[PDB]
Amino acid sequence: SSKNLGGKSSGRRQGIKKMEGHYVHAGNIIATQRHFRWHPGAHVGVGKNKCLYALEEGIVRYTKEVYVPHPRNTEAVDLITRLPKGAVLYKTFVHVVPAKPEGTFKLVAML
Amino acid sequence: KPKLRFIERAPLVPKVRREPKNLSDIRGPSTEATEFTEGNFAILALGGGYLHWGHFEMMRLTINRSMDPKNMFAIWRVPAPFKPITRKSVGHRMGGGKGAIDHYVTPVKAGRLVVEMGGRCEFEEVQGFLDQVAHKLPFAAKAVSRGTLEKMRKDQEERERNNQNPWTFERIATANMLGIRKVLSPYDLTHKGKYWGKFYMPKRV
Amino acid sequence: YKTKPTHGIGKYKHLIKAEVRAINLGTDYEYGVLNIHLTAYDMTLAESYAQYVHNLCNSLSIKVEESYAMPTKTIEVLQLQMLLDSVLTTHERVVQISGLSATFAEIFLEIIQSSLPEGVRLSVKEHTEED
Amino acid sequence: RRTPPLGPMPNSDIDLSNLERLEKYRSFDRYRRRAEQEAQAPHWWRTYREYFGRTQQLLERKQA
Amino acid sequence: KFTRSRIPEKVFQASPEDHEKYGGDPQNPHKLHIVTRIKSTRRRPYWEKDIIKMLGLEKAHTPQVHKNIPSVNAKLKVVKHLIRIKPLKLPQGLPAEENMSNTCLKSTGELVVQWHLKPV
RNA sequence: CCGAGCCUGGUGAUAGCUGGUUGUCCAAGAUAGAAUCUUAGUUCAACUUUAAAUUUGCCCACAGAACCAAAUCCCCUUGUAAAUUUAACUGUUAGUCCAAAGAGGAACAGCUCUUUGGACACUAGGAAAAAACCUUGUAGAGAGAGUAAAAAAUUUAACACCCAUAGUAGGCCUAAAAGCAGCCACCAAUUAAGAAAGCGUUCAAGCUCAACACCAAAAAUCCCAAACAUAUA
RNA sequence: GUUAACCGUGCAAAGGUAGCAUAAUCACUUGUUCCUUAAAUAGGGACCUGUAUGAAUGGCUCCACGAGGGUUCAGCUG
RNA sequence: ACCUCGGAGCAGAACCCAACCUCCGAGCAGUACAUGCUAAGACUUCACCAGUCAAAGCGAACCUCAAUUGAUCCAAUAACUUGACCAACGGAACAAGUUACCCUAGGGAUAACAGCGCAAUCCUAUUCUAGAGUCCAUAUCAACAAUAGGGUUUACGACCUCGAUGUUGGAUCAGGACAUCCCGAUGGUGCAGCCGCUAUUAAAGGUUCGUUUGUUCAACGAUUAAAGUCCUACGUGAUCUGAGUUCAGACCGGAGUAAUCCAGGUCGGUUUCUAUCUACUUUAUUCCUCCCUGUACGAAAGGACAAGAGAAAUAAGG
RNA sequence: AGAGUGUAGCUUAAAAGCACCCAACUUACACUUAGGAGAUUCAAUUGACGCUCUGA
Ligand SMILES: [Mg+2]
Ligand SMILES: [Mg+2]
Ligand SMILES: [Mg+2]
Ligand SMILES: [Mg+2]
Ligand SMILES: [Mg+2]
Ligand SMILES: [Mg+2]
Ligand SMILES: [Mg+2]
Ligand SMILES: [Mg+2]
Ligand SMILES: [Mg+2]
Ligand SMILES: [Mg+2]
Ligand SMILES: [Mg+2]
Ligand SMILES: [Mg+2]
Ligand SMILES: [Mg+2]
Ligand SMILES: [Mg+2]
Ligand SMILES: [Mg+2]
Ligand SMILES: [Mg+2]
Ligand SMILES: [Mg+2]
Ligand SMILES: [Mg+2]
Ligand SMILES: [Mg+2]
Ligand SMILES: [Mg+2]
Ligand SMILES: [Mg+2]
Ligand SMILES: [Mg+2]
Ligand SMILES: [Mg+2]
Ligand SMILES: [Mg+2]
Ligand SMILES: [Mg+2]
Ligand SMILES: [Mg+2]
Ligand SMILES: [Mg+2]
Ligand SMILES: [Mg+2]
Ligand SMILES: [Mg+2]
C-alpha cells in the first residue's frame, strides 16, 4: 500500500543567479535562498524571502567577512556568548562594487 | 572473561526508519578496524560481505569449543548486527511500497579483522579452528597472525615496486590514457585494480 | 565552497558544546560534584557566604554547575522553665563544584576555613540527594 | 577535490580538547572588539578591503 | 555517472628518463605540433567530438599544425587518446616565399623546403 | 445472423482505433519537461526544418559559488564558426541495450524507476550467427596501396626410519579412578624419555607421539569446424 | 460462569419454533459409524457447531408417473 | 491504497531529476489596521496560467510564518467587495450499478495457456566437522554455516504470438535424460548366514491388473524381479476422447434494494478440415523349479553363492 | 660569594590595553549601568637598591 505519501514538491530553482564578476544593473536579483547561505553586503538588499538583490550598477563580488549580528536578534547573540574567547564566526557575503560615478557636473549655459 | 560474548540478533531498540541498501558499505577496503588492538592473531576478511546472526553464532560457538580459556582469549572486532533488511512476503507482485523489516546484518569490508585472539600460545595452535571459521564465513577470509599479516604486506609492497610491466592500472586510470574512464568507475581511482565489487583480487597490482 | 581553500571558515558548531562520577585514577584526580551546605540562622549571612564562595570558585577556574537553596526549617522551640515560644529558622544554601586536582582541594578548604563567617556551619559531601 | 588552505585558517589554534575550561566571551562587547581586530588584520581570502579600501613632564602632569 | 575527466598535472611532467627515451629537450622546446587523429569521434562523448572538430581533425591520418601553447595543450588533453602528437621540427630554414610551393611533411615530422624527386 | 425485425432516408453517421495513402533526384533532420475524464490522445514547452536580421556562440584560466566522491556552474585567453533574435510551419511528445552513480526487487531477471555518457532505431569491418560490445562514418568508378578493431588460456595432493627403562598405581578428589573423568602441582634418576600430546582401558594393560641413539562434477533429438606442441615478427 | 438444565448480564421488533440435516445446501470434508465391494473421494441407513438448514422464498412425509440425475441384483453381450 | 500544497533523503559541491521509493508535515494561527498609492530593475517550480522580490518617488512613521490554497463563466452586491473537501484539488453547471444475453473497434503496447529470462522458493552434490550412532565426528544420519550445479514446483518478469500458438486428465504411439525402481558388475558396512543400509559403474531389456476418484495425485485390494524420477508446447486433439474445464438453461447456500454476482456446490450443454510442402512408411531378456543341500556360514533359529539340468513368462520373427 | 635580570596581576604596549575591586540589577553567577584603585627601584646607553637561581 505504502505508508508514506505526500512529498511530491518540485525544486524551488533557488541558488545564485549572478556569479562573481558579473555586471549587474540596479534591482537585479543576485541570489535566492531559504536560510542565509549567502548574506547581503555592500549595495545588496534583502527581500522577505532572504533573496539578495543589487542596489547599484556594477560588479558582483563574493567575500568571507566577519559576522557581527544585531544585538536585538537574540539567538545569534547567545551563540556568540557561548563561543570561546579567541574565536570569530566568519560568513560569506555578496558586495556590488559600483561601476559608474553617481553623476558628473556638466555645463548648462554661460550667463 | 576470555570467551566471545553473546551477539544478540537485532538491537534492543529497533529502528522504524527503513534504510536503503547502500552496497558501498561492502564495496572497497575497510577504513575501520584494519590494524590490531591487543590480540596477536585474528581472522582477516579478504572480501566484502554482510554477516548474518547465524554466522556470528557460528563464530562464537566454534571458537568457544576449541578455546583454552585459562591460556587464551578472544575479542569481537565487528559490531552487533545493525543494518536492517526488508524482505517482502512470499510471492508478491512488484511495487505497493517497500517491504517490512526481516533481519539485521553487519557490513564487513575487505581488510577488516573480524575476530581477534591472544594469550599464551603460538599461531600454529590457533590456525586450526580460525581457518575453519574463515571457511564457514560468507567471504574470502584468512586466519592471520600479526607477523603473517606484516609479511603479506611486505610481499604486496615488493610486488608494487618490482613488476617489469610498465603499465600499471593506476597510471592508465589517472592519466586517462584510453578514455578508459568511460569503462571504469569513479571508485576505480581509489580502489584501483585490486577491488571489484565486494571482491578483492589480492594478487594483482 | 568545498573545493576552494577557504572551505569551512564559517564552521562554528565545533566551538560550542550543545548536548556524575568521581574519577580518582593514579596521578590525575577528580572529586565528583561536591555540595557545600552552608547552614545558618541569618538569611543574609548564609547568602553572602555562598556568594563569596561562588566568586572564589570563579576566580580559581572551577565550575559551579548548581547554586540552589534548601528550604528554611521552622524549629519551633518551647523555652521551658511558663511557656515562652521562640520560632527559630535554619537556612541551608548550596554551591556545587565538580573538577578538583590533588593539591587544590586542601587549599580551597583552608581558604574556606579562613573566611568562615560568624555563626555559620559547613557540610561538604557528594551529590546523591533528594530535593 | 579538496584543496588545503593557503595560510592559517581562523579559529584553528584555540579549539583544543577541553572547550569547557576556556574563558569565552560572556559579553557582546568583547566579541565585537575581537571581530573588529580581525577585520583590521589582512587575511588571504579576499574581502571588503580588497575591493573597496619626558619623565619630568610626566611627573608634573601627575602632580597637577 | 560518466564524467568529463580532470587529469592531474603530475602526469604532464617529463622525467630525465622520459627525455632520454624521446627526442626533445626541456630548454628550447618545439614551437609547433603536428597533431594527427588516430581514432574515431564515434563511441565517445560529444565534448570530445566538438574538441576534435575545433582542432580541424575530422579526417583521420590527415595532419594539422598547432601552436605548442597552454590553451591548445589543454584542448589536446581533452582528446589526447584520440590523437598522435609529434613536434614539427625544421632541419632546413622555415619556408620563405620562394620555397612555399616546394614543401613535404614526411614521416618523422619535418617540413623540408627543398623537395626534389631525384635521389642522392 | 431478435438483449429487440427488415427496408429506405437522415448517413460520405462517428471512429484519440486498425488498415491503406501511387513519378525521379538531392538536401537538413532523433525522443528535457506541462497540464489534461489524461497517459492508445493533446495543447504548450524542448528538439527539429525553412526564409530572414545579426553579433557574438561554443571551447574556456586565475578569482569566486554554507553552514548543518566523480564532477558542475561561472569563466578572460586560445582553437574555431556560428549562436541569438525575427517571420512561417509541421512532426517527435507509447523507446531499447551497454558503461557509470543510485533507488525498488532476491546486492533475481532480456525485471522496474531516476541521473551522466555511449550506441542503436543510418553504411561498413569485427566479436561464430548478433540492434544496443569494439573499429569506423560525407558516399561514385578502378582487376591499386597502407591500416583499424579483430584468433582464450589452463592440469593440479608419496613421504619419513628407529626406540621407549625407572621415584610413581604423583597427591587431592574418587566405590575405582594409575601419563591420560575434574582440579591443584608439573618436581625429578640414569647419555636421554611430558607428572604426558593422540587413540585405548570398567580401573589396570597394551598401541603410538614428544626424547636418546642412527644418519572437482550431472539433463533430456546428435559430440561439434577439420586439424596442429619444432625453419627464425 | 455453574457437555451443560441453571445462574449473572446486555442489546432486539422478534430473537430460527416444528421439522429435517454432511443434503442439488461457503468452507473445514475422504466429517464419524453400520450395511454394500477382495478393495468404495460412489450408493443406502444412522449420528449432529447447519455459526451460511428451516416452513406458500413453503418445511417435512408419501401413492403413482419421469428419454430428469444417481446407486444396484441377475442376465446379456466384441 | 493514492489524486492539491510544503520540508528532508534518494539527488554528497550552479539549476533540474523518477517510482504504488524512504520520512515528516499543510488545508492555519498570531500581530497589525499606511496589510496606503505608485514604480526603475530582476527571479520563477523546466510551457502557459499562476507565483516571488524590489531601488527611487508620492503619502505616512520616528509584518511574523515553510505549506496554510482554487481559474473562467455565473451568482450575491448602490459600491467596495464575497461566494466551492469545484480535495478526481488547471475545476464538465448537474449523472449509477450490472451484463455468462451481449456487441463493435483495437491490443501480444496488457493478462490466462505454452515458450523465453531469472532462480527467491524447490531439488542435488561437495566443503566444514558441532551433534546423534554403549565408545567412535566420515557403517549410517546430521545442526550452524560455506562453494557449486539443476531447471521437476510455487511465484516474479511481460520479451514472441489476441487478422487465435486450442486447455485438465485418459487412450494411441512413444523419442530422450539418468539424478538406477528392477536386472548386471564392484567398494564400504554397526556385512557370520539369510535380509539389509550406503557409495561407485551401467540406460542393451523391463518397469502389472483392479475398487474409489473428471483428476494428476491419493488411499485401499491383489500381485510383481520391479511396479523408478523427470523431460519432450505440464510429449502426442489437422490421431481419438471431452468425464472435468472456458459460454448461453437451471436449482441450494451466501452476497446484493435489484439487474446480477461467488478463484462455492450441483444437473444440462455442437470438438470443423479432401494433406500443397518437409519428415517418415521390413536392421533376446526375465522369473520359477530340481539338484548343489538342508552343504558353505551359524552355538541354535535359521540358511547361501557360483557350476549344472529342467520348465515357464514376456518381447522379436515366422 | 657568583649568574639572570627589574612597566601595577600579565604583555614581539609605548605611562596603554586587558586582567582587578565596591555598588545597583541579580536565588547566585553572568551581562549591563554607575563608581574605585593602581605602576619605569634610584643617580649620570653606564653605575648603585630589589627579587629569582646557585653555593657557604
Ligand atoms: Mg523532494
Ligand atoms: Mg517532482
Ligand atoms: Mg470515416
Ligand atoms: Mg486515446
Ligand atoms: Mg542528410
Ligand atoms: Mg478535468
Ligand atoms: Mg528493460
Ligand atoms: Mg518494460
Ligand atoms: Mg571516405
Ligand atoms: Mg605400551
Ligand atoms: Mg458444505
Ligand atoms: Mg462404477
Ligand atoms: Mg413427461
Ligand atoms: Mg519559467
Ligand atoms: Mg520607498
Ligand atoms: Mg480531474
Ligand atoms: Mg489535476
Ligand atoms: Mg447464466
Ligand atoms: Mg471483436
Ligand atoms: Mg508483449
Ligand atoms: Mg508465462
Ligand atoms: Mg558424538
Ligand atoms: Mg492470443
Ligand atoms: Mg495469420
Ligand atoms: Mg549413474
Ligand atoms: Mg499438451
Ligand atoms: Mg497438433
Ligand atoms: Mg441429456
Ligand atoms: Mg476432431
Curated annotation (Swiss-Prot), chain A:
<dbReference type="GO" id="GO:0006412">
    <property type="term" value="P:translation"/>
</dbReference>
<keyword id="KW-0496">Mitochondrion</keyword>
<dbReference type="GO" id="GO:0003723">
    <property type="term" value="F:RNA binding"/>
</dbReference>
<dbReference type="GO" id="GO:0003735">
    <property type="term" value="F:structural constituent of ribosome"/>
</dbReference>
<dbReference type="GO" id="GO:0005743">
    <property type="term" value="C:mitochondrial inner membrane"/>
</dbReference>
<comment type="similarity">
    <text>Belongs to the bacterial ribosomal protein bL27 family.</text>
</comment>
<dbReference type="GO" id="GO:0005739">
    <property type="term" value="C:mitochondrion"/>
</dbReference>
<comment type="subunit">
    <text>Component of the mitochondrial large ribosomal subunit (mt-LSU). Mature mammalian 55S mitochondrial ribosomes consist of a small (28S) and a large (39S) subunit. The 28S small subunit contains a 12S ribosomal RNA (12S mt-rRNA) and 30 different proteins. The 39S large subunit contains a 16S rRNA (16S mt-rRNA), a copy of mitochondrial valine transfer RNA (mt-tRNA(Val)), which plays an integral structural role, and 52 different proteins.</text>
</comment>
<keyword id="KW-0689">Ribosomal protein</keyword>
<protein>
    <recommendedName>
        <fullName>Large ribosomal subunit protein bL27m</fullName>
    </recommendedName>
</protein>
<dbReference type="GO" id="GO:0005762">
    <property type="term" value="C:mitochondrial large ribosomal subunit"/>
</dbReference>
<dbReference type="GO" id="GO:0032543">
    <property type="term" value="P:mitochondrial translation"/>
</dbReference>
UniProtKB/Swiss-Prot annotation, chain B:
<dbReference type="GO" id="GO:0019843">
    <property type="term" value="F:rRNA binding"/>
</dbReference>
<comment type="similarity">
    <text>Belongs to the universal ribosomal protein uL16 family.</text>
</comment>
<keyword id="KW-0687">Ribonucleoprotein</keyword>
<dbReference type="GO" id="GO:0003735">
    <property type="term" value="F:structural constituent of ribosome"/>
</dbReference>
<keyword id="KW-0809">Transit peptide</keyword>
<dbReference type="GO" id="GO:0005762">
    <property type="term" value="C:mitochondrial large ribosomal subunit"/>
</dbReference>
<keyword id="KW-0689">Ribosomal protein</keyword>
<dbReference type="GO" id="GO:0005739">
    <property type="term" value="C:mitochondrion"/>
</dbReference>
<dbReference type="GO" id="GO:0032543">
    <property type="term" value="P:mitochondrial translation"/>
</dbReference>
<protein>
    <recommendedName>
        <fullName>Large ribosomal subunit protein uL16m</fullName>
    </recommendedName>
</protein>
<comment type="subunit">
    <text>Component of the mitochondrial large ribosomal subunit (mt-LSU). Mature mammalian 55S mitochondrial ribosomes consist of a small (28S) and a large (39S) subunit. The 28S small subunit contains a 12S ribosomal RNA (12S mt-rRNA) and 30 different proteins. The 39S large subunit contains a 16S rRNA (16S mt-rRNA), a copy of mitochondrial valine transfer RNA (mt-tRNA(Val)), which plays an integral structural role, and 52 different proteins.</text>
</comment>
<dbReference type="GO" id="GO:0005743">
    <property type="term" value="C:mitochondrial inner membrane"/>
</dbReference>
Swiss-Prot record, chain C:
<keyword id="KW-0809">Transit peptide</keyword>
<keyword id="KW-0496">Mitochondrion</keyword>
<dbReference type="GO" id="GO:0032543">
    <property type="term" value="P:mitochondrial translation"/>
</dbReference>
<comment type="similarity">
    <text>Belongs to the mitochondrion-specific ribosomal protein mL48 family.</text>
</comment>
<keyword id="KW-0689">Ribosomal protein</keyword>
<dbReference type="GO" id="GO:0005761">
    <property type="term" value="C:mitochondrial ribosome"/>
</dbReference>
<keyword id="KW-0687">Ribonucleoprotein</keyword>
<dbReference type="GO" id="GO:0005743">
    <property type="term" value="C:mitochondrial inner membrane"/>
</dbReference>
<protein>
    <recommendedName>
        <fullName>Large ribosomal subunit protein mL48</fullName>
    </recommendedName>
</protein>
<dbReference type="GO" id="GO:0005762">
    <property type="term" value="C:mitochondrial large ribosomal subunit"/>
</dbReference>
<dbReference type="GO" id="GO:0005739">
    <property type="term" value="C:mitochondrion"/>
</dbReference>
<comment type="subunit">
    <text>Component of the mitochondrial large ribosomal subunit (mt-LSU). Mature mammalian 55S mitochondrial ribosomes consist of a small (28S) and a large (39S) subunit. The 28S small subunit contains a 12S ribosomal RNA (12S mt-rRNA) and 30 different proteins. The 39S large subunit contains a 16S rRNA (16S mt-rRNA), a copy of mitochondrial valine transfer RNA (mt-tRNA(Val)), which plays an integral structural role, and 52 different proteins. mL48 is located at the central protuberance. Interacts with OXA1L.</text>
</comment>
From Swiss-Prot, chain D:
<comment type="similarity">
    <text>Belongs to the phosphatidylethanolamine-binding protein family. Mitochondrion-specific ribosomal protein mL38 subfamily.</text>
</comment>
<comment type="subunit">
    <text>Component of the mitochondrial large ribosomal subunit (mt-LSU). Mature mammalian 55S mitochondrial ribosomes consist of a small (28S) and a large (39S) subunit. The 28S small subunit contains a 12S ribosomal RNA (12S mt-rRNA) and 30 different proteins. The 39S large subunit contains a 16S rRNA (16S mt-rRNA), a copy of mitochondrial valine transfer RNA (mt-tRNA(Val)), which plays an integral structural role, and 52 different proteins. mL38 is located at the central protuberance.</text>
</comment>
<protein>
    <recommendedName>
        <fullName>Large ribosomal subunit protein mL38</fullName>
    </recommendedName>
</protein>
